[PDB]
Design a protein around this ligand. Structure first.
Ligand code: PLP
Ligand code: PLP
Lengths: 363, 363
């Protein structure tokens, strides 16, 4: 697949760009260009090009605007001391976009095309990648939407793959601050035979009310419990959860298993490997509120944190639910939590050795 | 709200429009104009206008394209013998859109504005409404999409309400024909507290694989079973289901109750009332596959049909599932099924008395 480039003749001035990079926030600003690739049953993926960031054209009856056939991904690009630009496990996001597409009846995008789209975008907007060393980075948002017109209900025959980039400083409004959680009693994130294992837009729209409720109960984020027994802890918003038992080199990590409805986070998969590298024992199993509250109060569960691309790792210090409320440890970020976060971020920034070859050069 | 009109400078020529009305199909062609209303926090619903049907623009980071915050409705406009243009229970759709909006954290659109948008579109595209005395009509598709840019996960603060129309010819060209169904053993349509009771795009994209599987099993449509026990019959694709016990004037009708995850179909609500008017006893309860197959085999259940705006009523003659297969009666459309369909379509067409005042004038 050959990419054609249509330079932006009116990009953001150096002043504006530098200003944005100084206080980027998250998903607020976007780079000067974006990648676009069209799909049709006859020509397959074609017309791959790098064009200026700008409004998209859609037919009023476009399937995505009626039957929500759409999927997305999220990863980052970092600038290293040697001036190189790299991404964290981009191949993993390429594979998950394919798995998400399959579940939503969307044509898969070749991984080499996915990776290439990333190189093409950085090639023109490399100056949007924050300076080396720091919590800042360039968030990459690959996504596919159904663009074929027609109000009939069925898989679209036309799709459009888009790749946009957004400078990122910090996702949450706390960063080095722990969050309180409300365990949803009324809502579920997904159920067996659903789309829980896919990065599907529909999953998020349906969770808006649950999040609003968490805040109304005086908590920062909502936490999901299995839809079958309404007992086992799954995730916190759009992030996976980890439970720390004990402390020091003898501490062990427990995280909900991939029941099939849980979203296989890449940060989650990476942290499991990092924990093992540090010598910590790991375990992927089911864990319910009862055990959580009991062991947390007993002092066995010393820390709890959520993980995801945007925030990397977010400490969980307070828990509230339909039948109780309790604090984790002293309510502050745990030792292991910060230890693993520093290790992961260090690897991503090129500070620590990348023994697993997770860092890929984009340039 | 005042509606400003911008006439289509390049409308469909008489030759083209006539060719379309002669063979419209469904959701394939669209009228010359569409309605558009914008929403912002500071101005709420505003800039209501009738403009030429055409491509709409959206920022690449528009929430609807990432987190699927969108909803829609489906109703029809009919031309009567007296020359007036009417619609079937439009107020009901206006109220359901508000219900869907609430579930998806979207600002509600006043019923008055909803109805008015329908009148405004007919005022300029009346020529697109099929002739009276037939089963043809004009399908109306009201829908709202989140348009605010930003990759952050939260309720949008900007939306756009759009209204498009598509001429619909006789649904059953070569006479009415029954369909075969496959009870989905692997997939579910929704879960408790989920978004099953809302006309939300996400629900459809997530069911694409299930429908494909139904066809792969040699069936026309997929039928949904409750996510909890995986035994109670819910719906057929995007249509509600009815079961007819016995026949004649003593026949009884059973239909799945509005558990909370079931979509409150307007056709469904209407048919229950019409069955009562005809003297038929009705029941809104749970019914599982076991009872269905057993009673259908014993001849107790004489007919089964699905209902929805598009097709009104569709007979179900064959059933296949993980643990069996059977036919309903002689495999042909049942007496009650056709009786109720003729009655409902007769009211919508103006042939029969509208004792409940369901028909509303649009002109
Ligand atoms: C994206 C996502 C995550 C995190 O995945 P990462 O690959 O670590 O970014 C976790 N849970 C859900 C539900 C998600 O959509
Ligand atoms: C729209 C819809 C229906 C039918 O509703 P009508 O108001 O009768 O058109 C039934 N089930 C689902 C899942 C739907 O989305």
């Amino acid at each position: 697949l050959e990419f054609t480039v249509s330079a932006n003749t009116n990009p953001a001035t150096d002043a504006v760009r530098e200003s944005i990079l100084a206080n980027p926030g998250f998903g607020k600003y976007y780079t000067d260009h974006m990648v676009s690739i069209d799909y049709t049953v006859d020509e397959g993926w074609h017309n791959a090009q790098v064009i200026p960031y700008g409004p998209i054209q859609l037919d009023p009856s476009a399937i995505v605007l009626h039957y929500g056939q759409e999927i997305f991904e999220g990863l980052k690009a970092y600038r290293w001391a040697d001036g190189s630009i790299v991404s964290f496990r981009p191949e993993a996001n390429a594979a998950r976009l394919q798995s998400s597409a399959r579940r939503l009846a969307i044509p898969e995008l070749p991984e080499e095309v996915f990776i290439e789209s990333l190189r093409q975008l950085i090639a023109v907007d490399e100056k949007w990648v924050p300076p080396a060393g720091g919590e800042e980075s360039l968030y990459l948002r690959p996504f596919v939407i159904a663009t074929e017109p027609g109000l009939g209900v069925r898989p679209s025959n036309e799709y459009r793959y888009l790749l946009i980039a957004s400078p990122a400083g910090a996702y949450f409004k706390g960063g080095i601050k722990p969050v309180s959680v409300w365990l949803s009693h009324e809502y579920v994130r997904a159920s067996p035979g659903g789309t829980g294992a896919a990065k599907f837009g529909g999953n998020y729209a349906a969770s808006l009310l649950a999040q609003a409720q968490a805040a109304e109960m005086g908590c920062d984020q909502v936490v999901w419990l299995d839809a079958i027994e309404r007992r086992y802890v799954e995730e916190m918003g759009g992030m996976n959860l980890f439970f720390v038992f004990g402390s020091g080199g003898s501490a062990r990590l427990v995280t909900p298993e991939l029941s099939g409805s849980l979203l296989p986070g890449i940060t989650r998969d990476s942290l499991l490997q990092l924990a093992t590298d540090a010598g910590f024992a790991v375990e992927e199993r089911k864990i319910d509120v009862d055990e959580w509250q009991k062991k947390a109060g007993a002092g066995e569960i010393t820390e709890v944190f959520a993980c995801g691309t945007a925030a990397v790792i977010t400490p969980v210090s307070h828990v509230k639910h339909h039948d109780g409320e309790f604090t984790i440890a002293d309510g502050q970020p745990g030792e292991i939590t910060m230890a693993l976060r520093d290790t992961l971020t260090g690897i991503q920034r090129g500070t620590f050795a990348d023994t697993h070859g997770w860092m890929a050069r984009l340039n």
